[PDB]
Amino acid sequence: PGSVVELLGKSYPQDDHSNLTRKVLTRVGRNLHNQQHHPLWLIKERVKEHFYKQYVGRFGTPLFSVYDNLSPVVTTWQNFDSLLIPADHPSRKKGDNYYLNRTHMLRAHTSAHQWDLLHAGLDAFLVVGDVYRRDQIDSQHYPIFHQLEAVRLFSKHELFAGIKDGESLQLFEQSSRSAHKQETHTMEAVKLVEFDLKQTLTRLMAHLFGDELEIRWVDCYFPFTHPSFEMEINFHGEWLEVLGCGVMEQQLVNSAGAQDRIGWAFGLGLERLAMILYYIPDIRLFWCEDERFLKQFCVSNINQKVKFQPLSKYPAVINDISFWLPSENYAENDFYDLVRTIGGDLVEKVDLIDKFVHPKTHKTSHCYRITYRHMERTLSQREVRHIHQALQEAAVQLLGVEGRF
Secondary structure, eight states: OOOOEEEEOOOOOEOSSSSOHHHHHHHOOGGGGGGGOOOOHHHHHHHHHHHHHHHHHTEEEEEEEEOOOOOOOEHHHHGOOOOOOOGGGGGGGGGGOSSSSSSEOOSSSSGGHHHHHHTTTTTTEEEEEEEOOOOOOOOOOOEEEEEEEEEEEOOHHHHHHTSSSGSSOOOOOOOOTTTTTTTOOOOHHHHHHHHHHHHHHHHHHHHHHHHHOOEEEEEEEEEEEEEEEEEEEEEEEEEEEEEEEEOHHHHHHHHITTTTOOEEEEEEEEEHHHHHHHHOOGGGGOOOOTTTTGGGGOSSSSOOOOOOOOOOOOOOOEEEEEEOOSSSSOOOOHHHHHHHTTTTHHHHEEEEEEEETTTTTTEEEEEEEEEEOOSSSOOOHHHHHHHHHHHHHHHHHOOOOOOOO
16 A cells, blocks of 8 residues: 555555556556457457448448557546446445545446447447456456446437438437336337347357347346346356446437437447356466467467367365454455455455354454465465465465454
């Protein structure tokens, strides 16, 4: 912890919100999504190719400009306010974000760029980048992952171009908001935008996974879209959400300068997609540099089909860690950072298997079961003991927790 943070050549004074970790910092700028041949870059190029094809292939398809090198450091206004996220919304919890301070943060999603790009006059674009969130620790969650945003605007004439008396139809009106549309949108408009959205995503998935993937649309919520959806893909007997989307909140589109227009947007988890497309077991493999893994994504063209062969799964070592939280001063996702710092990518997952308050003291006890597993080799009991003991001492010094063990 400190007084000034220096990130990407810029300086940020620290305050009550500051909670960025040196570990996260060592990863900012990495840009896996722009790394030639990396599984993520691969998915990026394939999505890009699809959009390009569609532009040249169909007259109605617009040209999508692509931005994959925007700095992840944004203002809380870009990441939250511009997307209409309430001041008291849980997604703002310091516990789930990496804030430099009260006004700047590492983006939690690529949607943080929607407003500025809209304000710049663009009608169709894609933003691809690393995003950051403080989350639990397991093979499916990492503090850093990547997303690809897409925004598509429609003018009234463009939307109803294929309808006989379409110029008589409108985009806007003043009714009420319902489960199916916004208060200022016509059902006519929404039905067409929604259909375009789903057809676009469905075709993209078809291009990425082939005609023989099981997908389902699920209704959800986002403060920046409505109606909103999550597309899920059934993989290994299990419906997994791979993207979020919907019809852009008109207030957002209006404040950016495009009253005129109505649009849709979506944000899809490149990791999630990659893990499904190539089986990848574990999110941590995206960050290793074991050429048993990377060498498998060295294709002649992004069209050559990678036939990923999962590495061996080495034995894990499991150790529990208990302690006392301080006096009303502690967060779960905190200890999770001490863990990422000390155990790094050696930790496969952390589980809070138990927690209780002592009557006398008033002083809550936490017991975490940490699974230590190397993605590249067999960890010995010895080295794990050393990492586990360092985590133990660190907890006691830098989480005011008491050595209960």
